[PDB]
């Protein structure tokens, strides 16, 4: 027993939201906890009331599967991307698309907003990321250098400003100013389909079917290796209390400590009634801004909402 981990309370499901007619491929929470977005395979973006779990609005306009959705914290905007090859900007003041970001060659898989510059960074199946100016809808740079499809992207204001994992099993840490690669991290054996940034401690983790790896930001130093959750993991998300969440394509989801990397909870949730036993799967998860709800976007066309169990310690290894 080299470390002793922090005690985290167990998480439990309390709400299953239903109503998409396709796989729910993305989810994001508004900065003020009033609502959350989902984007799905039925080409609709749905605004859901976060407290009551009720469908607030259904936006249409993508021609194919919506892959990523993010809400702007500085501007009153909603960015989305699809398998449409299209990257849209929704003015939430009007509930209408005002700008489309054109130039990707194949399906756009992810996007992240830069937190301080008004820059949008997207990934595609064409083995490139792109860097867009929001106001002029122009490609600033084309981050090229991956050899297979590019799965995920995260942005910062500190150094390396752009971080991406891809389906050629590597991770590239980039320079936003120059537009060239700074660090290549080849440690994973299978496709990196999730990366997540820590809110305080200036590290990041990344996930793949072999195992999940933690890393210091300036030059990608190896810090740790968190293993045991062996499936194609689609997302990673972090609570400021140091709770890592790793969800996968088999529907399983393991709850981890950030610091020591201790698996304290495994949640293998049940599918929807009509659904099929092979259709269990998670594509997206998010914490709310209170960091006490856990929103998962499932392959049985549902949203599941979890909260911490108020029945204290029954736990400790």
């Amino acid at each position: 027993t080299m470390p002793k981990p922090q005690w985290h309370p167990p998480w439990k499901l309390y709400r299953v939201i239903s109503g998409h007619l396709g796989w729910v491929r993305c989810i994001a929470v508004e900065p003020g906890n009033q609502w959350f977005v989902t984007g799905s395979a039925d080409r609709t973006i749905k605004i859901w009331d976060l407290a009551s779990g009720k469908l607030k609005l259904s936006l249409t306009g993508h021609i194919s599967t919506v892959r990523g959705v993010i809400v702007s914290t500085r501007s009153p905007y909603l960015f989305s991307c699809g398998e449409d090859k299209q990257v849209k900007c929704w003015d939430l003041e009007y509930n209408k698309v005002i700008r489309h970001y054109h130039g990707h060659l194949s399906a756009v898989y992810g996007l992240d907003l830069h937190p301080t510059i008004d820059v949008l960074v997207t990934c595609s199946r064409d083995s490139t990321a792109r860097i867009w100016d929001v106001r002029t809808k122009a490609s600033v740079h084309t981050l090229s250098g991956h050899t297979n499809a590019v799965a995920t992207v995260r942005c910062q204001a500190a150094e390396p400003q752009i971080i991406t994992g891809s389906h050629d099993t590597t991770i590239r840490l980039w320079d936003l100013v120059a537009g060239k690669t700074r660090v290549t991290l080849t440690n994973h054996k299978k496709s990196v389909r999730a990366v997540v940034l820590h809110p305080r401690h200036y590290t990041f983790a990344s996930g793949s079917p072999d195992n999940i790896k933690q890393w210091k930001f300036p030059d990608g130093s190896f810090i740790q290796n968190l293993s045991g959750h062996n499936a194609i993991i689609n997302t990673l998300t972090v609570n400021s209390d140091g709770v890592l969440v790793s969800g996968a394509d088999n529907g399983t989801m393991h709850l981890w400590d950030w610091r020591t990397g201790y698996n304290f909870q495994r949640v293998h949730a049940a599918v929807q009634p009509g659904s099929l036993d092979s259709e269990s799967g998670i594509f997206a998860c998010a914490f709310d801004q209170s960091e006490s709800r856990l929103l998962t976007a499932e392959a049985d066309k549902t949203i599941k909402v979890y909260r911490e169990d108020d029945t204290a310690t029954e736990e400790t290894h």
Partner: protein, 118 residues
């Protein structure tokens, strides 16, 4: 042959904005004109980041959760005929409450196939 799948996609980085803006082309579309040339920012009542920083979200979320749960709680002659009352206790049998993840067995699909095939 002619009819074939892909097995490798096209890689971006070799055209019109990719390396030198295709060596600075003077070609531009109608969709590349100046339009929406001013970013809107969140105002003080909208959700400006100064307004979002001091807030305790868990208490407000618990209040809204409580109000929503309270709203959902407060909401809720010829006697000689060969067949008697067949529908005795059928109080409409709430099929229209169930959501079923099967597109051939949804209640929407059953209504659809009943409505559009004669």
């Amino acid at each position: 042959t002619a009819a074939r799948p892909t097995f490798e996609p096209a890689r971006g980085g070799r055209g019109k904005g990719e390396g030198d803006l295709s060596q600075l082309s003077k070609q531009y579309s109608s969709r590349d004109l100046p339009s929406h040339t001013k970013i809107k920012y969140r105002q003080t009542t909208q959700d400006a980041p100064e307004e979002v920083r001091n807030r305790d979200f868990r208490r407000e979320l618990e209040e809204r959760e409580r109000a929503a749960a309270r709203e959902k709680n407060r909401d809720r002659w010829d006697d000689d005929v060969v067949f008697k009352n067949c529908a005795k206790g059928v109080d409409d049998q709430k099929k229209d409450k169930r959501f079923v993840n099967d597109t051939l067995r949804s209640e929407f699909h059953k209504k659809f196939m009943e409505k559009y095939i004669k």
